[PDB]
Amino acid sequence: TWNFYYERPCCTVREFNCGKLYYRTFHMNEDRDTLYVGAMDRVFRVNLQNISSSNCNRDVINLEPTRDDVVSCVSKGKSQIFDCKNHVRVIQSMDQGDRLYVCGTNAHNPKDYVIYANLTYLPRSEYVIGVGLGIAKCPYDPLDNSTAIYVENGNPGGLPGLYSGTNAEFTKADTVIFRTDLYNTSAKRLEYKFKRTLKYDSKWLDKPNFVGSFDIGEYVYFFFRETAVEYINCGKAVYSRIARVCKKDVGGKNLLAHNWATYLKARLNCSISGEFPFYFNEIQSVYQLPSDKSRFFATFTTSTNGLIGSAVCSFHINEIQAAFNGKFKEQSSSNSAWLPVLNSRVPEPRPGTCVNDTSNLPDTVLNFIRSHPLMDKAVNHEHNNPVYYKRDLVFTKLVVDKIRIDILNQEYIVYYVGTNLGRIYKIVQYYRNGESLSKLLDIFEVAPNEAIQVMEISQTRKSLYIGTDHRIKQIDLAMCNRRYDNCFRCVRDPYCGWDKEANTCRPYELDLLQDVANETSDICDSSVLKKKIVVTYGQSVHLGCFVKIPEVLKNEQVTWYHHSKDKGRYEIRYSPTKYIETTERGLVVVSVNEADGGRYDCHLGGSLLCSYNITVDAHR
Amino acid sequence: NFYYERPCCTDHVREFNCGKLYYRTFHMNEDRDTLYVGAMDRVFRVNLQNISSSNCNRDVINLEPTRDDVVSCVSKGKSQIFDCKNHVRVIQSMDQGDRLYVCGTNAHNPKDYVIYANLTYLPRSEYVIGVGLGIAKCPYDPLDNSTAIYVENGNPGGLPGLYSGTNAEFTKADTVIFRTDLYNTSAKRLEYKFKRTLKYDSKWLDKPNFVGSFDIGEYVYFFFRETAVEYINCGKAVYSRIARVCKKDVGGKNLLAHNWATYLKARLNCSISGEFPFYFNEIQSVYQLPSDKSRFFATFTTSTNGLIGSAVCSFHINEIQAAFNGKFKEQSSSNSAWLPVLNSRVPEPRPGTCVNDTSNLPDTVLNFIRSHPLMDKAVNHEHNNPVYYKRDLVFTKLVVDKIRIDILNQEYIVYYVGTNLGRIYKIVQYYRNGESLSKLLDIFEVAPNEAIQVMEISQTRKSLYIGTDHRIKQIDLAMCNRRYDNCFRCVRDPYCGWDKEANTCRPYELDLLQDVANETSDICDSSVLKKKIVVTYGQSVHLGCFVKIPEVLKNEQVTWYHHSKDKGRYEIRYSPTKYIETTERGLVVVSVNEADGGRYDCHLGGSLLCSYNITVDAH
Ligand SMILES: *[C@@H]1O[C@H](CO)[C@@H](O[C@@H]2O[C@H](CO)[C@@H](O[C@@H]3O[C@H](CO[C@H]4O[C@H](CO[C@H]5O[C@H](CO)[C@@H](O)[C@H](O)[C@@H]5O[C@H]5O[C@H](CO)[C@@H](O)[C@H](O)[C@@H]5O)[C@@H](O)[C@H](O[C@H]5O[C@H](CO)[C@@H](O)[C@H](O)[C@@H]5O)[C@@H]4O)[C@@H](O)[C@H](O[C@H]4O[C@H](CO)[C@@H](O)[C@H](O)[C@@H]4O)[C@@H]3O)[C@H](O)[C@H]2NC(C)=O)[C@H](O)[C@H]1NC(C)=O
Ligand SMILES: *[C@@H]1O[C@H](CO)[C@@H](O[C@@H]2O[C@H](CO)[C@@H](O[C@@H]3O[C@H](CO[C@H]4O[C@H](CO[C@H]5O[C@H](CO)[C@@H](O)[C@H](O)[C@@H]5O)[C@@H](O)[C@H](O[C@H]5O[C@H](CO)[C@@H](O)[C@H](O)[C@@H]5O)[C@@H]4O)[C@@H](O)[C@H](O[C@H]4O[C@H](CO)[C@@H](O)[C@H](O)[C@@H]4O)[C@@H]3O)[C@H](O)[C@H]2NC(C)=O)[C@H](O)[C@H]1NC(C)=O
Ligand SMILES: *[C@@H]1O[C@H](CO)[C@@H](O[C@@H]2O[C@H](CO)[C@@H](O[C@@H]3O[C@H](CO[C@H]4O[C@H](CO)[C@@H](O)[C@H](O[C@H]5O[C@H](CO)[C@@H](O)[C@H](O)[C@@H]5O)[C@@H]4O)[C@@H](O)[C@H](O[C@H]4O[C@H](CO)[C@@H](O)[C@H](O)[C@@H]4O)[C@@H]3O)[C@H](O)[C@H]2NC(C)=O)[C@H](O)[C@H]1NC(C)=O
Ligand SMILES: *[C@@H]1O[C@H](CO)[C@@H](O[C@@H]2O[C@H](CO)[C@@H](O[C@@H]3O[C@H](CO[C@H]4O[C@H](CO[C@H]5O[C@H](CO)[C@@H](O)[C@H](O)[C@@H]5O)[C@@H](O)[C@H](O)[C@@H]4O)[C@@H](O)[C@H](O[C@H]4O[C@H](CO)[C@@H](O)[C@H](O)[C@@H]4O)[C@@H]3O)[C@H](O)[C@H]2NC(C)=O)[C@H](O)[C@H]1NC(C)=O
Ligand SMILES: *[C@@H]1O[C@H](CO)[C@@H](O[C@@H]2O[C@H](CO)[C@@H](O[C@@H]3O[C@H](CO)[C@@H](O)[C@H](O)[C@@H]3O)[C@H](O)[C@H]2NC(C)=O)[C@H](O)[C@H]1NC(C)=O
Ligand SMILES: *[C@@H]1O[C@H](CO)[C@@H](O[C@@H]2O[C@H](CO)[C@@H](O)[C@H](O)[C@H]2NC(C)=O)[C@H](O)[C@H]1NC(C)=O
Ligand SMILES: *[C@@H]1O[C@H](CO)[C@@H](O[C@@H]2O[C@H](CO)[C@@H](O)[C@H](O)[C@H]2NC(C)=O)[C@H](O)[C@H]1NC(C)=O
Ligand SMILES: *[C@@H]1O[C@H](CO)[C@@H](O[C@@H]2O[C@H](CO)[C@@H](O)[C@H](O)[C@H]2NC(C)=O)[C@H](O)[C@H]1NC(C)=O
Ligand SMILES: *[C@@H]1O[C@H](CO)[C@@H](O[C@@H]2O[C@H](CO)[C@@H](O)[C@H](O)[C@H]2NC(C)=O)[C@H](O)[C@H]1NC(C)=O
Ligand SMILES: *[C@@H]1O[C@H](CO)[C@@H](O)[C@H](O)[C@H]1NC(C)=O
Ligand SMILES: *[C@@H]1O[C@H](CO)[C@@H](O)[C@H](O)[C@H]1NC(C)=O
Ligand SMILES: [Cl-]
Ligand SMILES: [Cl-]
Ligand SMILES: [Cl-]
Ligand SMILES: [Cl-]
């Protein structure tokens, strides 16, 4: 039994673990080398350089509910062990990181806070006006999918405020996209009233699950999936949406003063191209690169039992704005069709555009947008197809990394996509011959049968951070020297390069070998070593390049060759009595004789992978 | 010394090949032991017992288009090699089989014929009135999907007539479901005018592709896929339909006389169950057993480029009639949703029901049905899940067979499903505990990369007949000895039985072993392959039952058990240093020692597949 390469299992890599605390909220602050984690009854300040160095009892603030709040929550039929806890669901930086805004479920009684960055309470004299009640700022239910973002700049009066998407009621009958009251916190006076979507109006929102929100220029964008109201007459479906509000929105003048006057939403299109596209309807997560505010990356799943499938799509801000600039959709009555409105038949100023004072808008614009929140055009995804899609898996969360290779400034986009079963799919995207291409590079086993709940990526520490309900894992982005003991896998990873002279994989450098796009399939040929083995007569010998072949290679074509003086190099054909194929793509040679000696070559995916030289010796 | 799956099937397989003639139309006549085949410019009279015994030049009638018809077709931009040919698309039995009704595309100028059974023309004195022009009876385009059925009984006046679904114009603008003029042949008089769907009305038909038509009781049924008009406001889809007309239909009066007065259609529902069902939207073929008119069997595919799949669904006549007895659908204006009609708004007699003279119907009934052809309820498939479905396959045609082991209590349905790549999937359906189960039994290789165009099954010759554009194949239904060299797969086939004495698979008889429904999982235990191996100490040994594991068994659970003196029977767990799993569900035991001797059992699907006895020789 002979094996060339042993690729180390990944990644059941550092861990932070304080029990099953439902680690579902991340807020990274690289300026303080900290990953803030919201969990059950707790905010942790986790060290970004090495999460294992943090202490469960020191790097924490305990926010457990009062026993009075627990009893009241239990009295309403909720569970003492899980529901009637304070699950932290918002953590946002304030005052240049000196303080944190925190919101938690607080035993189905949402409560929010402002605390110091070191996780201590403000003095009583320093309590921030307008903070305490978390209703509409974060959910009651720890299983909800909500979103929030704290926005310092661009709001009315230049005042900071929280934008949120969550359920605002214990019965879950009031989902809302929300902005808090805006205070002059020094003067202790409320300046701008809160904003909310129209209650009881299924055209604005219908059972949404929120997956992200972003502060970009003059707007705040919200990402969510919801009941597809415009599909009801044809069947049952969930659609994905991006909603947009103007930061300067102050609502209408009198009885519309608390509702958005600029709220618009559009369907998100993630689909396989064709005469009849295959749509992935349910967005699960969205991410934006720190260096690129013009793009969003998102995961989508199907809704059906019979065809489980998931995809990654990206969307450009230009295509989002084209949707919001296109025709509005209209259902003039409950039993009518949904029809486009000619843009020339829309009132002015254009609904959804940021005017100086929405409270001065004509009633005809206010009335229009209240009945036309949905755009007729869907937001097209970049390129013709998803970045990546695959059957029988449920993508959940994702982050994205952008890297440039030094030798010729080649750019690669790397997706880290979590699953409901605790795996990470590592996908690389690149452009060749005018087209967008992607390759699945690796599957990480992070936590068997533990759904990925939250992900973050640090550029200062070159690490991936992954939250499940049981643990946090930290994975180095460049696992070159540890994970790759072979040129084959090394040159396919955009973080790595193969050092032929040293026979090692290293974080990429100019002189190192790399071929992410598979343009030079012989790049590792001179690095393939020939292992010389001695086999006794009649004995069977197991030849394999990997002890366990990486899962992403299991479907590649494998060809074995034997070198003889009479045949030259010829392809080995599997037979029941001589040449057996193993599930790990190995070769078993049965009853080795003199003619079976010599060189064996294993090619995988069109590249020489490993090579053996067999010498046959007597049974001694 | 292993199980070996013999390739199949490029116990016999016969071929009829006269070149690439696009053999796409079958008409089987078992009484005359003949398979009539319609092809390019030709109808063949193929021997049903042995299709290879037929001659390409003797058992054929040449129906090539005239020079003017070719010239006219070529001048319109159509290809002379393929488009401007006479592709036969309808063959039906007439006069107790003494004559055949034939319709061909005739270089985009459809023409029809009545010929003798021996494929010779009638004399001029016998030319049949109303026969000659094939418009609305079979398509212009050889690539069109059309259907037609010649109906002898139940029409007005008791006269025979052709029912068809096809395109009636060269421009393909006018798709029609049609009934020909009904003549009294003896008296040479037209008795009833033709019937057609409402011209250019996209709510009656919208770019349909027809896959079948059936004559049942007082109705003719049509199966087709079409643009989903009731879906247009939500997106772009194709839906599958069953449509129904009363054979007694004579239309309305005045400008309504030439239109159906009983035409209804309903969506066909083939889907995987769930909170969000997965629909297979595009019906490709439909089949009825000769002995059971209460059920329809059909293939469906998806519409997408990515993540494609196909399914087989069955439909019962009780669900079909429930759809046509349900509420009508209605879009009252171009700005209206599609909604059910209140039953109090439905006039009497009920639209779509068969009356003795539809031209005597009240205005309200005729106006209602002409504006409400689509029923609100979809036709639910039996069992609420497909009989079978598979990703990444494109099903085309199918035929179905019914097997009854009658001294036992079992009944089995075997589906033969062709693919666009020349394969046949053989699926068995059976009922246990009242729930429907299915198993993929086999995958025949009929013609690599040649789409299956037409299929027929003969009970008198117990044969499967398959047509592609290049060839015709005839396959014995009982391939028992040729296909299965082992008890394990033999007992799973409803046609076959394992002979314990001769140790061979034979066509099923009483006292042979069979277990299609896996009700006796140890039935083959005494018949499985059993091998004894003497290995030397430290030597490795490869154990395996199959030379190559059959494709259809690649999904089953395989478990290896070891009987040692020190540990009894226990499950072997794979490990790179001791127990190496091999590609064909085998096992390599590495560096055998004394404790590794004994019995090794391989289980597949929970049944013993083969067994090894290892004795270790000390060195
Ligand atoms: C594939 O299968 C098919 C079906 O199985 C095969 O088809 C068979 O093919 C054969 C060969 O062609 C057919 O046989 C032949 O039939 C014809 C027609 O027969 C009928 O008409 C005859 C002529 O009638 C006129 O003339 C007589 C006599 O002068 C006169 O009394 C009549 O009144 C009539 O005259 C008038 O009408 C004319 C217009 O019709 C006017 O122009 C004219 O001026 C007058 O006004 C008639 O004699 C004949 O009668 C016979 O048959 C009937 C029953 O059908 C019977 O009742 C009678 O007593 C007679 O027995 C028919 O009414 C015929 O003309 C052919 O004759 C030649 O061949 C025979 C030998 O077979 C010789 O004896 C003759 O002298 C003559 O040379 C021949 O009989 C057959 O009908 C047909 N079968 C079917 C069911 O269609 C086909 O062959 C297969 N193909 C292959 C490749 O294998
Ligand atoms: C083909 O066969 C398959 C298998 O046999 C079959 O599958 C079932 O498919 C359904 C989905 O279609 C699965 O789910 C159920 O769906 C029921 C229907 O729900 C929808 O339709 C409602 C009615 O709409 C009609 O009326 C309007 C009027 O304006 C019209 O436009 C429409 O076109 C249509 O004609 C619609 O109201 C409803 O929307 C409301 O409710 C949802 C949430 O329920 C909400 O989000 C919306 O905002 C809106 O308020 C929806 O669009 C549904 O009734 C059913 O729910 C009951 O049963 C479940 C248990 O399954 C309970 O949990 C629930 O509380 C309800 O009591 C359920 O949701 C169903 O599971 C499949 N069944 C199987 C066995 O797989 C297909 O339907 C067949 N297809 C066809 C075309 O026939
Ligand atoms: C999400 O993002 C994806 C990818 O970016 C978008 O994908 C595009 O989707 C459309 C479908 O929505 C694909 O098809 C197009 O369909 C339209 C409309 O088609 C229908 O209406 C026609 C007019 O009424 C009718 O003629 C059509 O019927 C014919 O074709 C169908 C099959 O297509 C067939 O079944 C019929 O028998 C007819 O033969 C059909 O009912 C159509 O107008 C488009 O194109 C025509 O014109 C262009 C310009 O010349 C030509 O290039 C086309 O070939 C066609 O002739 C087109 O067919 C379209 O292919 C998808 N595009 C890609 C790149 O994949 C998707 O729309 C987005 N969704 C949303 C909600 O935004
Ligand atoms: C915020 O977003 C998240 C992410 O999208 C939402 O999370 C999803 O929530 C739903 C509903 O809560 C979850 O579904 C449930 O999972 C429960 C646990 O799973 C078991 O079964 C798994 C396998 O499933 C089996 O059944 C199917 C059915 O055909 C078979 O095909 C399959 O082969 C299996 O046999 C096991 O792997 C697992 O170990 C568990 O054993 C289920 O119990 C649950 O079903 C129950 O509830 C149904 C109604 O919800 C009811 O119909 C059933 O009868 C049963 O009572 C259901 O399947 C998703 O798993 C979860 N996704 C992720 C990624 O976490 C979340 O809901 C959302 N928040 C809000 C507030 O909406
Ligand atoms: C009648 O039904 C058949 C079967 O459903 C239809 O055939 C399908 O037709 C499409 C369109 O021509 C074929 O797709 C094409 O594939 C080729 C390459 O394979 C590509 O170059 C084309 O652009 C197109 O994508 C499809 O293969 C074919 N399927 C089979 C099984 O033949 C046919 O179109 C129907 N007839 C009419 C008139 O619609
Ligand atoms: C990350 O921090 C943890 C905890 O400080 C380190 O783990 C300890 O390392 C010391 C020194 O090697 C050992 O004596 C302890 O036994 C380790 N503890 C555990 C729980 O393993 C870890 O080495 C640090 N990782 C890096 C890369 O610095
Ligand atoms: C947590 O942070 C707060 C605020 O930064 C710290 O409080 C201050 O502590 C410094 C150091 O003694 C004083 O000079 C300031 O006057 C304090 N300000 C206030 C408002 O109290 C606090 O000491 C930190 N706590 C821990 C444990 O690190
Ligand atoms: C079916 O018909 C074919 C064709 O007549 C038969 O095959 C021929 O068999 C003879 C006798 O061995 C050969 O000389 C010919 O060369 C064969 N023809 C071809 C085209 O190969 C076949 O035996 C028949 N099968 C039966 C009767 O079961
Ligand atoms: C075929 O039938 C056998 C016998 O009932 C099935 O085996 C049983 O499976 C259940 C559930 O997995 C086990 O609890 C029993 O111990 C099994 N019995 C034996 C004797 O193995 C088997 O699963 C069936 N196979 C298929 C594919 O349905
Ligand atoms: C890499 O390229 C070779 C030939 O250039 C090809 O045979 C092989 O399939 C490719 N592998 C992958 C993973 O694309
Ligand atoms: C056709 O008409 C003739 C006489 O006109 C008659 O004998 C025959 O029965 C009619 N056929 C039918 C089917 O009614
Ligand atoms: Cl939590
Ligand atoms: Cl416009
Ligand atoms: Cl076999
Ligand atoms: Cl043809």
Author numbering:
A (entry chain A): 30 to 41, 58 to 665
B (entry chain B): 32 to 41, 56 to 664
Excerpt from the publication:
The semaphorins are the largest family of evolutionarily conserved axon guidance cues. The semaphorins signal through their main receptors, plexins, which are single-spanning transmembrane proteins expressed in a variety of cell types, including neurons, cancer cells or endothelial cells. We determined crystal structures of Drosophila Sema1a1–2, Sema1b1–2, Sema2a1–3 and Sema2b1–3 to a 3.6-, 2.8-, 2.1- and 2.5 -Å resolution, respectively. All structures contain the sema domain composed of a seven-bladed β-propeller fold, which is followed by a PSI domain.
The secreted semaphorins Sema2a and Sema2b also contain an Ig-like domain positioned C-terminally to their PSI domains. For example, the Sema2a construct used for crystallization contains eight potential sites for N-linked glycosylation (N95, N163, N190, N229, N314, N401, N563 and N658) and the N-linked glycans were clearly visible and unambiguously fitted into the electron density at N95, N163, N190, N229 (only chain B of the dimer), N314 and N563. Our crystal structures of Drosophila semaphorins revealed that the dimeric architecture in Sema1a, Sema2a and Sema2b is covalently secured by an intermolecular sema-to-sema disulfide bond formed by a cysteine from each of the β4B–β4 C loops of the opposing chains (Cys279 in Sema2a). In the class 2 semaphorins, besides the interchain disulfide bond, dimerization is mediated mainly by the top face of the sema domain using five protruding surface loops, which intertwine with each other to form a massive interface burying a total of 4496 Å2. The Ig-like domain of the class 2 semaphorins is also involved in dimerization and contributes 21% to the total buried surface area of the interface. Remarkably, in the Sema2a structure, an N-linked glycan at residue N314 forms intermolecular interactions with the surface residues of the neighbouring chain. Approximately 17% of the total buried surface area between the two chains of the dimers is contributed by this N-linked glycosylation. The simulations revealed a low inter-domain flexibility that is also obvious from the structural superposition of two independent protein chains observed in Sema2a crystal. The Ig-like domain can reorientate relative to the sema–PSI domains by 14° about a hinge point in the PSI-Ig linker. A superposition of Sema2a1–3 and Sema2b1–3 crystal structures unveiled that Sema2a and Sema2b are also highly similar in structure with an rmsd of 1.1 Å over 608 Cα atoms (for Sema2a chain A and Sema2b chain A).
